[PDB]
Amino acid sequence: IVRPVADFSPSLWGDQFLSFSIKNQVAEKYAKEIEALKEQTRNMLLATGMKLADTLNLIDTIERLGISYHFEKEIDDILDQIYNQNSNCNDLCTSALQFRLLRQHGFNISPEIFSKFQDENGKFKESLASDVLGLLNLYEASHVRTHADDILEDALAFSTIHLESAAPHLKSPLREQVTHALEQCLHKGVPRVETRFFISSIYDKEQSKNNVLLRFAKLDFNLLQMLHKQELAQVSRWWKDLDFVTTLPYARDRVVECYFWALGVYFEPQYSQARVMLVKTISMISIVDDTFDAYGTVKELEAYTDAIQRWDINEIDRLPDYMKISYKAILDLYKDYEKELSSAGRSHIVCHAIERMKEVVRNYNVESTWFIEGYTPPVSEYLSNALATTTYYYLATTSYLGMKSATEQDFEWLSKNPKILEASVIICRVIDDTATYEVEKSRGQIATGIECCMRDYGISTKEAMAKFQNMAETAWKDINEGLLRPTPVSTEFLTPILNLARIVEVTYIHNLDGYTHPEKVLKPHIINLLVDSIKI
Numbered sequence: 001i002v003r004p005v006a007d008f009s010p011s012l013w014g015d016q017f018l019s020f021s022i023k024n025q026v027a028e029k030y031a032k033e034i035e036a037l038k039e040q041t042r043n044m045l046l047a048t049g050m051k052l053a054d055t056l057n058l059i060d061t062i063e064r065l066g067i068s069y070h071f072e073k074e075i076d077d078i079l080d081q082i083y084n085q086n087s088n089c090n091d092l093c094t095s096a097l098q099f100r101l102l103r104q105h106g107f108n109i110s111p112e113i114f115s116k117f118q119d120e121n122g123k124f125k126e127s128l129a130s131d132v133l134g135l136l137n138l139y140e141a142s143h144v145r146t147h148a149d150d151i152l153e154d155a156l157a158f159s160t161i162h163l164e165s166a167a168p169h170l171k172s173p174l175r176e177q178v179t180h181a182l183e184q185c186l187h188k189g190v191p192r193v194e195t196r197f198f199i200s201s202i203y204d205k206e207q208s209k210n211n212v213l214l215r216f217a218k219l220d221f222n223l224l225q226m227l228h229k230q231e232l233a234q235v236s237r238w239w240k241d242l243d244f245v246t247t248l249p250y251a252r253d254r255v256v257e258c259y260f261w262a263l264g265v266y267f268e269p270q271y272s273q274a275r276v277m278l279v280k281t282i283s284m285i286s287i288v289d290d291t292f293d294a295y296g297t298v299k300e301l302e303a304y305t306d307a308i309q310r311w312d313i314n315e316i317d318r319l320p321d322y323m324k325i326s327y328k329a330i331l332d333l334y335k336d337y338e339k340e341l342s343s344a345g346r347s348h349i350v351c352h353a354i355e356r357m358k359e360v361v362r363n364y365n366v367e368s369t370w371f372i373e374g375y376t377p378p379v380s381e382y383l384s385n386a387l388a389t390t391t392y393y394y395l396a397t398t399s400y401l402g403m404k405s406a407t408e409q410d411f412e413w414l415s416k417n418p419k420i421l422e423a424s425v426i427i428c429r430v431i432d433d434t435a436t437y438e439v440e441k442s443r444g445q446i447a448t449g450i451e452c453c454m455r456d457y458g459i460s461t462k463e464a465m466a467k468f469q470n471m472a473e474t475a476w477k478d479i480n481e482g483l484l485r486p487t488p489v490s491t492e493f494l495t496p497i498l499n500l501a502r503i504v505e506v507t508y509i510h511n512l513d514g515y516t517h518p519e520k521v522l523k524p525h526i527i528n529l530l531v532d533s534i535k536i
């Protein structure tokens, strides 16, 4: 058996994350100050007699500064009041902000709030083209539409062209904020990534900045960063003691990138256990993926697939030595999860993730069979298999394991492939297929998504990519609609799914692959989130 040649770049991080010793004095000092700043900020939110515009700008600022997770109740009460008073008498910037904040929080505010800014034709009044703050908030708002918001169909094009036109002559930091928004809208960005940018590049440089909020935002970001570094060290240790880097040398060494992904799903301190569980699963399914993609023979992958379905340590002997390694590691990981969830009486939920992993592996094997046969399925058949191979049903399920408040009913809802989950999975599938089409085509993978699309509909590569882009836009509208009240489960269990879609958009930004090639996209984010603190 002549295996393929090892082609993955080594981890670019070395051991720089392996050992992090927290300074308790600094941590305790930060925590104590934050407690005081947190109360000052609460009183700012609860101030009586504030105008609508000032209230919305305060909430927006606290959200972008990344400290809104301290004020979920206060912010919810205030937006709920604004939603129910149905105030509809403002300029474009307050109106667009009002619409975006309410929708992001699941309040189904009517899009008719935008009619007064449009002509008879439903097109935005071009006279608004010189109101840069209106255009900027309209722009951000355009990304939260559902299928019921066709009144906003023109908003992205309109605001984009006039923001591009205005940008070079804007003062700083507004210019940098506009320029940044045109590359990465807020609603589809990774929250920590956008927070780090806003704090350091924008709010820190605003003439009108509130000093209490800025100091609060920097201390809190740097304090949470200490936690993230501890987690990453603990996970780096775990990965090192498995030593796949030498026993399974065909496989990508990407535990830092995997941690960044888990950090994108949730950054808050109460999700520490959930993050560590999640990153271990992303790491491990990545190994399995490389086993199917870049090492195993058809015969070996069959045995591996069947062994996974039966899920029993008895089965290791049917496997080649090198597969014994990952298989025992997989089984042990899930035994660890059960043990770690035992004191909370939540061990029994691990089976939900196990069943999703089995599904991923079944579909991995189908994908291998297709490649070997030179099969090009129709799109419907392609999708029936390739949606699960995104791993996104599996990761979403995994993200619930460490969430203390996730119940059996939450897992039951997720097992039915709800619409919002399906949309998130679709976004991952079509964006990766658009970005990795050329490579996969070079490797002979004739069952890749865009190829299936071209052959099925009889259209060009360009037209197929346009069709996949439409699928992503439709899926984003479904995600946005999936967040609207009443939600089928607590919003706490929707946000991970939204954040999985965001991570996709951020990792494949401008359409190149970012996990297998972390040098382009992910490296700067990892440095800004997990290496450099924000200077105070």
Ligand SMILES: CC(C)=CCC/C(C)=C/CC/C(C)=C/COP(=O)(O)O
Pocket: 282, 285, 286, 289, 293, 389, 390, 391, 428, 429, 432, 515
């Ligand atoms: C499979 C891996 C590396 C999972 C861990 C990181 C992750 C969640 C990536 C996004 C999911 C996709 C689209 C993976 C594409 O794998 P293929 O090139 O088709 O074998």
Ligand SMILES: [Mg+2]
Pocket: 289, 290, 293
């Ligand atoms: Mg792969």
Ligand SMILES: [Mg+2]
Pocket: 289, 290, 292, 293
């Ligand atoms: Mg694969």
Ligand SMILES: [Mg+2]
Pocket: 432, 433, 436, 437, 440
């Ligand atoms: Mg791909």
